[PDB]
Amino acid sequence: MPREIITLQLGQCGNQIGFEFWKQLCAEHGISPEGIVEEFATEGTDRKDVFFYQADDEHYIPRAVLLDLEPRVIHSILNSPYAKLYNPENIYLSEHGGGAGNNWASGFSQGEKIHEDIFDIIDREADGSDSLEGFVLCHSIAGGTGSGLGSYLLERLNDRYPKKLVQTYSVFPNQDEMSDVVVQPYNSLLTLKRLTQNADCVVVLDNTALNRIATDRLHIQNPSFSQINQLVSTIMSASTTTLRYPGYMNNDLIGLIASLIPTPRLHFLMTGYTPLTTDQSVASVRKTTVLDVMRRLLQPKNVMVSTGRDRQTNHCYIAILNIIQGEVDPTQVHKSLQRIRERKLANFIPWGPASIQVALSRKSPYLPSAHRVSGLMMANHTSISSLFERTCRQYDKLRKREAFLEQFRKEDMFKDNFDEMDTSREIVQQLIDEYHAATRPDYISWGT
Amino acid sequence: MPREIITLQLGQCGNQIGFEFWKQLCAEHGISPEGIVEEFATEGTDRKDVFFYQADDEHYIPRAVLLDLEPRVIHSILNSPYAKLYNPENIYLSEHGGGAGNNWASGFSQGEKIHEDIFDIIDREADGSDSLEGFVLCHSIAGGTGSGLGSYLLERLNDRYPKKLVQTYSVFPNQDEMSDVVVQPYNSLLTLKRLTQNADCVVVLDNTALNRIATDRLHIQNPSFSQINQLVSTIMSASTTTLRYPGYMNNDLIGLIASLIPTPRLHFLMTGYTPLTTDQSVASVRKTTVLDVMRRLLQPKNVMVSTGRDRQTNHCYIAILNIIQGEVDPTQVHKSLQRIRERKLANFIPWGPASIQVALSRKSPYLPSAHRVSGLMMANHTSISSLFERTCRQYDKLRKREAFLEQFRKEDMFKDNFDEMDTSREIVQQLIDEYHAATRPDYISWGTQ
Amino acid sequence: CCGNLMQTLKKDYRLVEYLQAMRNFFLMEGGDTMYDFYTSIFDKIREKETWQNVSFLNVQLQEAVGQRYPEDSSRLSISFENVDTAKKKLPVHILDGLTLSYKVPWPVDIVISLECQKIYNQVFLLLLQIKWAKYSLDVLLFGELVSTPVRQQIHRMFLLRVKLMHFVNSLHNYIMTRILHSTGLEFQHQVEEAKDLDQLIKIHYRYLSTIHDRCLLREKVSFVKEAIMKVLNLALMFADGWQAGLGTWRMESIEKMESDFKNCHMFLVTILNKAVCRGSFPHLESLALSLMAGMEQS
């Protein structure tokens, strides 16, 4: 049986990101927003049971749980054509609609109030899943609702599925955009805390890098928060296509992530995609080669993590996996590997075998690809520590400054102190050092 | 892999020259105005990546950058059938469209205003360039837009690629026509300043000399600026044939130019083209031999530079490179060089060894050649100083009268003084003196304080 | 019968295609790709990178061929042996460890014998050495010399470099066009006229013998080969000084290099005159005249 994945949508921003992810998955699998398979979805080569459940004998419903502390996003989903994609018993909407006030603690408290309902939803989805692998949480770490609700979801997944993997999508704040969520560093700290304690894998999504990609690659002059969340959902979809479109390799989530997670704590992954094309730029079919793709992937503009220039750590890739989707020529893959090796596009850990893995996958026949050849890279790269170190430094600065904590102080997690944020910052600092260690032979002990 | 070249078109004249160059290259390579290879372009032996980039799987886009301070010329280019040939991301147009007012300093200030956009275009082209050697600037030195924009482009190329060579296609002002732009010599001086300081090689194209050559060689009584641009495009095509038809010689820019440039200061090149024919005279295929080809190339009526008869200085060729394209017998090339030396058809520098280098090249298979043998001459000739001396005399004549300087005084570079023009005049005077010295054995001490 | 055999050999065994590949690789007919290759090689030598790695050289060669001649990329193979630079003082001779191999199918391998393959590889090696010297002289950047304060000495060194470059380029052009290109055209014409396989073998052997003669490989030209090697060594020392720039090349050292170049040129001219008067290499007179062509009589 397929390894089913439960999608957790947390807070307003997280629920929007989850909704856009489910829309993209439906489009790739030819699932209508109502849960009905489109007539064009004739390619039974995709693993729908990994990401979708059947609501009836005909309707496939995404295994997505939409949880928000603000009613705007959840109500927009329930008023959208995608209202039938989510399990209604897995949808919690705050009656007050006031959100978390950009306070992680308020979102966490809202998750705690729906903790029983959320874990009942997760268990129901697992029983509706023939071979549920674990839970995947889609949220933003920078807001209040999506961050706190994401931490709550990670906690409840750990409580309900303690032997199952819990992956998180933790959005790091945009450093080029002024975040309206002043408590984002506190929110980031709460999300990093939950990723360390209650999530099994945290994919760090730096909104600064997403914005950079949107500007240079997607030609988006001013990426909206909705546009950033949709870019993140598209990147996650492309990286997970081999899980959602079963093939010869990477047929399970644990097999895919095993190469990526050197230590149980060192589960912070960076992503890369090549070739990057905007949906609008479909007109010019650029003859992008696999070698050209691999060359573009090594550009920091194509890395889905906005790492600061750390001068102290000799950042390197711990591991690199490139998942390529679409029409791929094996000779082009070979030329790509040749160009990557000759150009030394990845530096690997000295403590274990590491390389740039290349997987070739067919594209979804139901999803139009703006690129003749596309690929996602998921990589563990010590330069992600510079993003993680920056997130940790911001967390420590917010907790030490109690910035925007008054909205969080209404919730018990942040009411008296920000010690959970400071412990999260310390854990993230140790993670950054381990990633720097992961560039070093001492990587065998990285994350200890 | 090909050494990609970014073409920089500066001001109205430069942009027109670039447009005509791209048209000629498209015609020679069988590239459609949209960038699509024509079905007749079956000879996959050309290196498009040297001069063109692929915009899509079908469209080849010229590595050309069109820069102007006045919108009229850029809009006229974008309204032509060739609008789709160039990559649009490499096109920077000044929003004000006002041009430089025939002021080099104004053109430079406009370049500074479009500096960010221009350097972003240049960087985009560099990433689109597999092995970018450097930038080629097409501009006029007499106007404001082409001159100032050319100086700006030279400055920014020197800043961004200080270790890379910078060749320019620099249109020199017509010296036989009275310019209505009284400050043109000031503009020309500023352009010569930038060529001396920020360009590595300046090919001077005198529109007066172009008209004279068209009259004597092309039988064109009044060469239009468009006709001059088409002649320049033909010259560029012939120079790129070895890129499109790889062969035994001149397969790289450094290999081609190394023999021609003995010293960094002696970077003023003269050009020659062969066969020169009038459009009507294509009919008679003369069985020209390599010796006959070289003899026809040696006619001043076929030289695209009108050097004055200096009676005081024994001007001589510093170096000559003959690039011959087409069906060439090696024994005929050898006999041609032998006859040229025996006939003393070229005077060489007295201070060092100098000769006419001869390269035999295949023609591009994608461009039908009406001539069994074609040839480019590259020559370093001390008589080019007479062009430089004439430019200096014009500068001194304009600067001494401050004529039309108020248009330059509007721009910050010339608002307070003309010190950039005076330094340009001094550098050009030293260059002229060295070129005259370079015709003499005392060239060993030429340029010594 | 012989006509049928020759037709079959031309059509099924791609003999002409094999000769064209030999020209592309051994004769550097792929001038753009081989130019980029030799430029990368000369840059690696200039960067003091390890070029004597057969694996690195073979990877770069396979990438160069696969970019432009992917079908031929599988038949060509290159090996690199580290040349003892202490024994082979000329930087061009660092390349003498390179072994290029081309995969000739049966029965065409009967024509491209191991001795034929050895001769082709020797010609390839000579061409590679010439290309290395050429790139080393062409890649001499004036900016590398600009660091030294002696403007007049810098200019004189640049002019001496220009003169030496003109001489070396003239020799290279003589070999490529008057020897290599002319002999290639002759070989192609003779192969077109080849009526039988024995006639084709004889034509190929004549072509190879002509190259070997023009390559000064005969014992009769050993003294000439050594003189040529001396001149090439002078050229290599000039290229090394150019790479070191005028900051390392002092005016005394520039003048000394110019003197050594002039002395070598005089010695070469005298050797050529003795050979011409001996009548042993009358074709070299045109090459000798070309090498003295455009050189100022110092």
Which one-letter DSSP state was computed for residue A351? Answer: S
* Cα separation, A448 vs A430, whole angstroms: 9
Which element (helix H / strand E) includes A18?
helix A11-29
| 3-state DSSP assignment of residue A161 | coil
Site of tokens 């062009």:
B387
- Residue B147 assigned ligand-binding role: yes
- CB within 8 Å: B444 and C156: yes
| 3-state DSSP assignment of residue A398 | helix
Minimal Cβ distance to C137: which of B2, B258, B348: B258
Interstrand relation of B167-172 and B201-206 (parallel, antiparallel or unpaired): parallel
* Cα separation, B11 vs B148, whole angstroms: 8
**Nearest chain A Cα distance for residue C129, angstroms:** 25
**Partners of residue A361 on adjacent β-strands:** A325
* A29: its two tokens: 């699998």
* Cα separation, B238 vs B304, whole angstroms: 14
Q: From chain A, pick out residues whose CB is under 8 angstroms from the CB of C63.
A: 338, 342
Contacts 24+ apart (CB under 8 A), C124-129: C124/C25, C124/C26, C124/C100, C125/C95, C125/C96, C125/C98, C125/C100, C126/C215, C127/C26, C127/C27, C127/C28, C127/C180, C128/C38, C128/C95, C128/C98, C129/C92, C129/C93, C129/C95, C129/C96, C129/C232
Which one-letter DSSP state was computed for residue A82? Answer: G
Q: Which residues of A are annotated as a binding site for GTP?
A: 142-148
In contact, B408 and B202? CB cutoff 8 Å: no
Q: From chain A, pick out residues whose CB is under 8 angstroms from the CB of B57.
A: 285-287, 372
Question: Other C-beta atoms within 10 Å of C134: how many?
Answer: 27
In contact, A16 and A226? CB cutoff 8 Å: yes
- CB within 8 Å: B57 and A283: no
| 3-state DSSP assignment of residue A51 | helix
Of the candidates C270, C170, C188, C176, which has an alpha carbon nearest to the alpha carbon of residue C215?
Answer: C176
Provide Rg for chain C, Cα atoms.
Answer: 21
One-character DSSP codes across chain C: -HHHHHHHHHHHS-HHHHHHHHHHHTS---HHHHHHHHHHHHHHHHTT-----HHHHHHHHHHHHHHH-HHHHTTEEEEE----TTTS-SGGGGGGGEEEEE-PPTTHHHHS-HHHHHHHHHHHHHHHHHHHHHHHHHT--GGGTTTSS-HHHHHHHHHHHHHHHHHHHHHHHIIIIIIIIHHHHHHHHHHHT--SHHHHHHHHHHHHHHHHHHTT-SGGGHHHHHHHHHHHHHHHHHHHHHHHHHHHS-HHHHHHHHHHHHHHHHHHHHHHHHHHHTTS-HHHHHHHHHHHTT----
* Cα separation, A242 vs A245, whole angstroms: 5
Which ranges in A94-245 belong to alpha helices (H)? 104-113, 115-127, 145-160, 184-197, 207-216, 225-244
Of the candidates B369, B282, B363, B278, which has an alpha carbon nearest to the alpha carbon of residue B328?
Answer: B363
CA dist B125 → B128, B286, C214 (Å): 5, 43, 45
**Nearest chain C Cα distance for residue A262, angstroms:** 31
Name the residue in chain C with its Cα closest to that of B248. Answer: C31
Of the candidates A78, A143, A137, A67, which has an alpha carbon nearest to the alpha carbon of residue A105?
Answer: A143
Query: C-side interface with A, Cβ within 8 Å?
Result: 59-60, 63, 66
In contact, A409 and A105? CB cutoff 8 Å: yes
Q: From chain B, pick out residues whose CB is under 8 angstroms from the CB of C182.
A: 330-331
Q: Provide the sign of the torsion angle of the four alpha carbons B227, B229, B231, B234, taken in this order.
A: negative
- CB within 8 Å: A287 and B54: yes
Tell me phi and psi for residue B373, to 5 degrees.
Answer: -130, 130
- Residue B383 assigned ligand-binding role: no
Q: From chain C, pick out residues whose CB is under 8 angstroms from the CB of B249.
A: 173, 176-177
- CB within 8 Å: C139 and B248: no
HSE on the CB side for C279, CA within 13 Å?
0
**Nearest chain B Cα distance for residue C106, angstroms:** 29
Q: From chain A, pick out residues whose CB is under 8 angstroms from the CB of B84.
A: none
In contact, A27 and A367? CB cutoff 8 Å: yes
- CB within 8 Å: B55 and A286: yes
Name the residue in chain B with its Cα closest to that of A296. Answer: B127
- CB within 8 Å: A372 and B57: yes
Q: From chain B, pick out residues whose CB is under 8 angstroms from the CB of C158.
A: 262-264
Q: From chain B, pick out residues whose CB is under 8 angstroms from the CB of C167.
A: 353
**Contacting partners of chain A (3+ CB pairs under 8 A):** B, C
Q: Give the per-residue SS3 of chain B.
A: CCCCCEEEEEHHHHHHHHHHHHHHHHHHHCECCCCEECCCCCCCCCCHHHHEEECCCCEEEECEEEEECCHHHHHHHHCCHHHHCCCHHHCEECCCCCCCCCCHHHHHHHHHHCHHHHHHHHHHHHHCCCCCCCEEEEEECCCCHHHHHHHHHHHHHHHHCCCCCCEEEEEECCCCCCCCCCCHHHHHHHHHHHHHHCCCEEEEEEHHHHHHHHHHCCCCCCCCHHHHHHHHHHHHHHHHHHHHCCCCCCCCHHHHHHCCCCCCCCCEEEEEEECCCCHHHHCCCCCCCHHHHHHHHCCHHHECCCCCCCCCCCCCEEEEEEEEEECCCHHHHHHHHHHHHHCCCCCECCCCCCCEEEEEECCCCCCCCCCCEEEEEEEEECCHHHHHHHHHHHHHHHHHHCCCHHHHHCCHHHHCCCHHHHHHHHHHHHHHHHHHHHCCHHHHHCCCC
- Which residues touch B406 (CB under 8 Å, ≥6 apart)? none
B1–chain A Cβ distance below 8 A for any pair: no
Question: Other C-beta atoms within 10 Å of A45: how many?
Answer: 12
The whole-angstrom distance between residue A217's C-alpha and the CA centroid of its chain comes to 19
Q: From chain C, pick out residues whose CB is under 8 angstroms from the CB of A290.
A: none
* Cα separation, B447 vs C295, whole angstroms: 23
- Give me the torsion for CA of A100, A103, A104, A109, rounded to 10°: -50
- CB within 8 Å: A342 and C59: yes
* B377: its two tokens: 């001459």
In contact, C296 and B352? CB cutoff 8 Å: yes
The whole-angstrom distance between residue B162's C-alpha and the CA centroid of its chain comes to 20
Q: From chain B, pick out residues whose CB is under 8 angstroms from the CB of A285.
A: 56-58
- CB within 8 Å: A342 and C66: no
Burial (CB count within 10 angstroms: exposed 0-12, middle 13-18, buried 19+), residue A423? middle
A265–chain B Cβ distance below 8 A for any pair: no
Which element (helix H / strand E) includes A340?
helix A330-342
Interstrand relation of B268-274 and B167-172 (parallel, antiparallel or unpaired): unpaired
Q: From chain B, pick out residues whose CB is under 8 angstroms from the CB of A283.
A: 56
* Cα separation, C195 vs A68, whole angstroms: 87
A342–chain B Cβ distance below 8 A for any pair: no
- CB within 8 Å: C31 and B246: yes
Minimal Cβ distance to C39: which of B252, B356, B357: B252
- Residue B308 assigned ligand-binding role: no
Of the candidates B215, B202, B260, which has an alpha carbon nearest to the alpha carbon of residue B387?
Answer: B202
* Cα separation, B159 vs A51, whole angstroms: 53
Question: Other C-beta atoms within 10 Å of C70: how many?
Answer: 12
Contacts 24+ apart (CB under 8 A), C123-127: C123/C26, C123/C27, C123/C211, C123/C215, C124/C25, C124/C26, C124/C100, C125/C95, C125/C96, C125/C98, C125/C100, C126/C215, C127/C26, C127/C27, C127/C28, C127/C180
* A364: its two tokens: 């979804």
Which element (helix H / strand E) includes A425?
helix A419-437
Question: Other C-beta atoms within 10 Å of A163: how many?
Answer: 5
Q: Give the per-residue SS3 of C36-71.
A: HHHHHHHHHHHCCCCCCCHHHHHHHHHHHHHHHCHH
Which one-letter DSSP state was computed for residue A443? Answer: G
- Which residues touch A88 (CB under 8 Å, ≥6 apart)? none
In contact, B67 and B95? CB cutoff 8 Å: no
Chain A, 270 to 309: residues with Cβ < 8 Å from chain B are 283-287
The whole-angstrom distance between residue B181's C-alpha and the CA centroid of its chain comes to 22
* Cα separation, A163 vs C251, whole angstroms: 79
To one decimal, the resolution in angstroms is 4.7
Query: A-side interface with C, Cβ within 8 Å?
Result: 335, 338, 342
* Cα separation, B305 vs C73, whole angstroms: 46
Relative orientation angle of helices A184-197 and A384-401, to the nearest 10 degrees: 120
Interstrand relation of C98-102 and C76-80 (parallel, antiparallel or unpaired): antiparallel
The whole-angstrom distance between residue A397's C-alpha and the CA centroid of its chain comes to 25
| 3-state DSSP assignment of residue A175 | coil
From first CA to last CA, the distance across chain A in angstroms is 35
Question: Other C-beta atoms within 10 Å of B219: how many?
Answer: 12
- Residue B144 assigned ligand-binding role: yes
One-character DSSP codes across A184-199: HHHHHHHHHHHHHHT-
Of the candidates A199, A14, A3, which has an alpha carbon nearest to the alpha carbon of residue A91?
Answer: A14
Name the residue in chain A with its Cα closest to that of B130. Answer: A292
* Cα separation, A197 vs A267, whole angstroms: 11
The type of residue at B426 is E
**Nearest chain B Cα distance for residue A284, angstroms:** 5
In contact, C239 and C136? CB cutoff 8 Å: yes
Q: Provide the sign of the torsion angle of the four alpha carbons C68, C71, C74, C76, taken in this order.
A: negative
**Nearest chain B Cα distance for residue C182, angstroms:** 6
* A322: its two tokens: 């490139």
Burial (CB count within 10 angstroms: exposed 0-12, middle 13-18, buried 19+), residue A247? middle
In contact, B309 and B385? CB cutoff 8 Å: no
| 3-state DSSP assignment of residue A411 | coil
Tell me phi and psi for residue C78, to 5 degrees.
Answer: -120, 135
**Partners of residue A26 on adjacent β-strands:** none
Site of tokens 């026949």:
A365
Of the candidates B50, B14, A269, A80, which has an alpha carbon nearest to the alpha carbon of residue C31?
Answer: B50
CA dist B235 → B145, B281, B309 (Å): 24, 18, 25
* Cα separation, A65 vs A139, whole angstroms: 11
Q: Is A347 left (phi over 0), alpha (psi -120 to 50) or beta?
A: beta
Q: Give the per-residue SS3 of C213-254.
A: HHCCCCHHHHHHHHHHHHHHHHHHHHHHHHHHHHHHCCHHHH
Q: Provide the sign of the torsion angle of the four alpha carbons B153, B156, B162, B163, taken in this order.
A: negative
B37–chain A Cβ distance below 8 A for any pair: no
Name the residue in chain B with its Cα closest to that of A287. Answer: B57
| 3-state DSSP assignment of residue A447 | coil
A254–chain B Cβ distance below 8 A for any pair: no
Question: Other C-beta atoms within 10 Å of A175: how many?
Answer: 18
**Contacting partners of chain B (3+ CB pairs under 8 A):** A, C
Which element (helix H / strand E) includes A50?
helix A48-51
Which one-letter DSSP state was computed for residue A238? Answer: H
* Cα separation, A212 vs B32, whole angstroms: 35
* C54: its two tokens: 């057969």
Interface A-C, measured as beta-carbon pairs within 8 A, has a size of: 6
Q: From chain A, pick out residues whose CB is under 8 angstroms from the CB of B59.
A: 284
Interstrand relation of B356-361 and B167-172 (parallel, antiparallel or unpaired): unpaired
**Residue of A294, A337, A338 to mutate, testing the C interface (most C Cβ within 10 Å of its Cβ):** A338
- Which residues touch A118 (CB under 8 Å, ≥6 apart)? A65, A67, A90, A92, A111, A152, A153, A156
Which element (helix H / strand E) includes A24?
helix A11-29
- Give me the torsion for CA of B123, B125, B127, B132, rounded to 10°: -100
- Which residues touch A8 (CB under 8 Å, ≥6 apart)? A14, A18, A64, A65, A67, A122, A135, A136, A137, A138, A139, A150, A153, A157
**Nearest chain A Cα distance for residue C242, angstroms:** 29
* Cα separation, C288 vs A200, whole angstroms: 79
- Give me the torsion for CA of B27, B10, B137, B407, rounded to 10°: 150
* Cα separation, C294 vs C284, whole angstroms: 17
Q: From chain C, pick out residues whose CB is under 8 angstroms from the CB of B358.
A: 173
Question: Other C-beta atoms within 10 Å of A383: how many?
Answer: 25
**Partners of residue A269 on adjacent β-strands:** A203
**Residue of C61, C63, C67 to mutate, testing the A interface (most A Cβ within 10 Å of its Cβ):** C63
